[PDB]
Amino acid sequence: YAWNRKRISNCVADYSVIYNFAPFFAFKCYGVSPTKLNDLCFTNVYADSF
Amino acid sequence: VIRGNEVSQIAPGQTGNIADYNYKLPDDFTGCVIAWNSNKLDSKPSGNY
Amino acid sequence: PTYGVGHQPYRVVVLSFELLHAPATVCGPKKSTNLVKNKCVNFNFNGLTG
């Protein structure tokens, strides 16, 4: 009910180091593919943890 | 033997570490993939190397 | 063994099949039938049905 929201901007994002941080099975994505996140790039990334 | 993160990379048309440098499946691959947990056999409390 | 379920070891066996270009060598348990000619029949030649 009080989920955090962290803004991520002005940095280089390496999405392959996420797998070494938490023990999860699938990097479930909807609009993109989890293996193509290192080539294309965005404006802002928002992280919501609950 | 791989880890649980990289089971999704054993698939045709995949990009990662195992798919690019260890084990690559073709784009027109036909066949089956069978993966199962082996925590009780391939792991030790001191660390299997 | 104290690691998470996403970092536990996993045994992977990949079975790759060669589709029919040569005479078949690996065929499963189906009994054969005597060949009949000059009659409208259903046929099953090495998995090719017709």
Q: Measured between CB atoms, does C28 come within 8 Å of chain A?
A: no
Q: Measured between CB atoms, does B22 come within 8 Å of chain C?
A: no
Residues 6+ apart with CB under 8 A from C42: C49, C50
CB atoms within 10 A of CB A50: 6
Angle ∠(C29,C33,C36) on CA atoms, nearest 5:
150
A8: three-class secondary structure by DSSP? strand
Amino acid letter for position A31: G
Instruction: Please answer whether residues B43 and C4 qualify as being in contact, where contact means their C-beta atoms are separated by less than 8 angstroms.
Output: no
Decide if C15 and B32 are in contact by the 8 Å CB cutoff.
yes
Experimental method: cryo-EM
> Nearest by CB to B30, which of C3, C11, C19?
C19
Q: Chain A partners of C7 at a C-beta cutoff of 8 Å? A: 23
Structure tokens at B41: 């056999």
Instruction: Please answer whether residues B14 and A35 qualify as being in contact, where contact means their C-beta atoms are separated by less than 8 angstroms.
Output: yes
Distance CA B31, CA B22 (A): 19
Q: List the resolution, Å.
A: 3.0
Nearest CA of chain B to the CA of C20: how many Å?
12
Instruction: Please answer whether residues A46 and A8 qualify as being in contact, where contact means their C-beta atoms are separated by less than 8 angstroms.
Output: yes
In whole angstroms, how far apart are CA C45 and each of B2, C20, C27, C41?
A: 40, 11, 11, 12
Instruction: Please answer whether residues C9 and B5 qualify as being in contact, where contact means their C-beta atoms are separated by less than 8 angstroms.
Output: no
Instruction: Please answer whether residues C14 and B44 qualify as being in contact, where contact means their C-beta atoms are separated by less than 8 angstroms.
Output: no
Q: Measured between CB atoms, does C5 come within 8 Å of chain A?
A: yes
